[PDB]
Write a protein that binds this ligand. Structure first.
Ligand SMILES: [Ca+2]
Ligand SMILES: [Ca+2]
Ligand SMILES: [Ca+2]
Ligand SMILES: [Ca+2]
Lengths: 146, 11, 18
């Protein structure tokens, strides 16, 4: 999990949309100016909550390091979600939205592991939270995250 | 870009 | 594991990280 210089530069441009005066910090007033400029109207309490979620040192404003930490963490989340979606679609060989036992057995072989049907069936049972005998996308997400 | 960042700031 | 077999979750985590 890491960012390139170019990605950091883009996040600095995003930061500058919020840091209205260019001092290097985002205040609740600056975040509220942005939101109002988009037709929103959050309360002061809501704005402070949003600052606090990113404000790691508790000083009441968001600096670029704090902003970057947050954008990096969210980027890591988005990238993980895409990797899991791609892996799901590879397993769902016919594209019908469900991994069958035969698809699981064939795709694991293709990915480098030889399973018996005994093993395959056990894996389907482990994943199957809706009792339909197949692994759907949500079930696959739950296995890949726990 | 504004919308993108706000999604991440939303509670 | 569950008894002598690997859990599905273990296999999937490894395949993704490969
Ligand atoms: Ca500022
Ligand atoms: Ca701070
Ligand atoms: Ca399928
Ligand atoms: Ca199912």
């Amino acid at each position: 999990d890491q960012l390139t210089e170019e990605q950091i530069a883009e996040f600095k441009e995003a930061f500058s949309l919020f840091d209205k005066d260019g001092d290097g910090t985002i205040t609740t007033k600056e975040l509220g100016t942005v939101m109002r400029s988009l037709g929103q109207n959050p309360t002061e309490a809501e704005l402070q909550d949003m600052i606090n979620e990113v404000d790691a040192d508790g000083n009441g404003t968001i600096d670029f390091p704090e902003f970057l930490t947050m954008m990096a963490r969210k980027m890591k989340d988005t990238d993980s979600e895409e990797e899991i979606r791609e892996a799901f679609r590879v397993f769902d060989k016919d594209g019908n939205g469900y991994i069958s036992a035969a698809e699981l057995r064939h795709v694991m072989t293709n990915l480098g592991e030889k399973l018996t049907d005994e093993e395959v069936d056990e894996m389907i049972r482990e994943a199957d939270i809706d009792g339909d005998g197949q692994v759907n996308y949500e079930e696959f997400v739950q296995m890949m995250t726990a | 870009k504004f919308s993108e960042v706000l999604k991440r700031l939303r509670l």
